[PDB]
Subunit: 69 residues, 10 copies
């Protein structure tokens, strides 16, 4: 009895400045997340560009659980 | 008895000057944010994509992803 | 009786003039952030990709990744 | 009974003029952040990739990665 | 009964003028951050890659990695 | 008594399945043809100027360019 | 008494398959033809200026270019 | 009494499956043809300037260039 | 009496499957033709300037360049 | 009486499967043809200047260049 499952228990969180970005381009090609022709979780930040800035980003209580077959 | 299942349990949160400037000047931008050509794709946090991509204070709290397969 | 599972228990967090300047100038950038050509890919912290990539104070607290295989 | 399991228990965290400047200039940049051509790939801390890549005060606290094989 | 497992219990953390200038200039840059061509690949601390790569004060506190064979 | 003359004396001629093929393909070309100032110019042959310039059997007989300046 | 003359005596002629192929493919070309100043000029042969310049059988007979300046 | 003349005196001619192939493929070419001044110039043969410059059977007979300056 | 003249006399001609192939493939070429001044120039032979410069059977008979300066 | 003259009496000609193949492949070439000044120049034969410079059968008979300068 094939059963390609995935057994997941996942979370908790019980709680109780200047930024400047200047840019100039010409003829840019960007591919953020591709898939050509197999899972792809994301639980934190994925930043993609020609200029990519990430500040104070991934702060607290993440969970990723994957399964397969 | 094939059963391509997935046993999910994913949630909890029982919680009891600022300047941002972005100036840009492009020419001929070709952007593909999230593609799929011819298999699942979860997202539980930020996915930023551009020619200029800024992300500040984004993912804070109780982020949960389960996955299974077919 | 195949069962290609992933047995997961994963999280918790129980709590109780800064200047950033980025200046750029390009010509003919070709950027591929996360590809897959023709295979799991978890992401639990930051993935930053560009021609200028700056990450500050990013991954602080309670990250968990569990994977399986078939 | 072939069962390519991954047995995971993973986390916890129970708590109780800074200047950054980045200046760049390029011509003809080709950047591939995370590729896969034709295989798990966990990520629990930062992955920074560019032509100029700066990571400051990044991975501070409670990270866990668990993998399996098949 | 081949069961290619990975048996993981992994974490804890129970707590109780900084200037960074980076300037650059290139021409015709080709960067590949993390490739895989044709295989587990964990990451539990910072992975920086570029023509100019600066990582300051990054991996500070409570990481854990565990993998399996195959 | 200035006299900044010019004597031009220039003419006479007392005369008693070839295949040509040109293909061109351009993206974003820019031409300037003969002149720009911020100064005479006598022409009696071909001045051919382009991104693809072909001149076949052009100047034949009694080309008689005269010039004089002061 | 200045007389910044020039005296020109210049002409006469008392005269009693073939395959040419050109293919050109360019991208982002820039051409400046024969002059730019910020100054006499006499032409009687083919002045050909291009990115692909072909001149066949051009100057035949009594090319009589004559110039006299001050 | 200045007289910065010139006696210019020049002409006569009393005359009683060739395959040519050119292929060119360029990217980002810049051509300046003859002159960039910030100055007499007599021409009576072919002046060919390119990134591919072919001159066949050009100057035949009575090329008669005459110059005189002051 | 300044007289900075020129006596130029230049004339006469009393005349009673060739395959040529050129292929060129360049990238990022820069050509300057004959002059960049910040000055007499007589031309009566072929002046060819390129990144591929071919000159076949150019000067034949009665080429009579004549110059006189002061 | 200053006379910075020049004198020339010059010409005459009283005349009563060839395969050529050139290929070229370059990258980042820079050519300057004959002059970069910051000055007489008589030309009587093929001045061929290039990265690939070929001249064939170029000068034949009665090229009777002359000058008398200063």
């Amino acid at each position: 009895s094939k059963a390609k499952e995935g057994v997941v228990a996942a979370a908790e969180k019980t709680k109780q400045g200047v930024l400047y970005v200047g840019s100039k381009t010409k003829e840019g090609v960007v591919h953020g997340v591709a898939t050509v022709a197999q899972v792809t979780n994301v639980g934190g930040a994925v930043v993609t560009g020609v200029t990519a800035v990430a500040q104070k980003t991934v702060e607290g209580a993440g969970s990723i659980a994957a399964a397969t077959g």
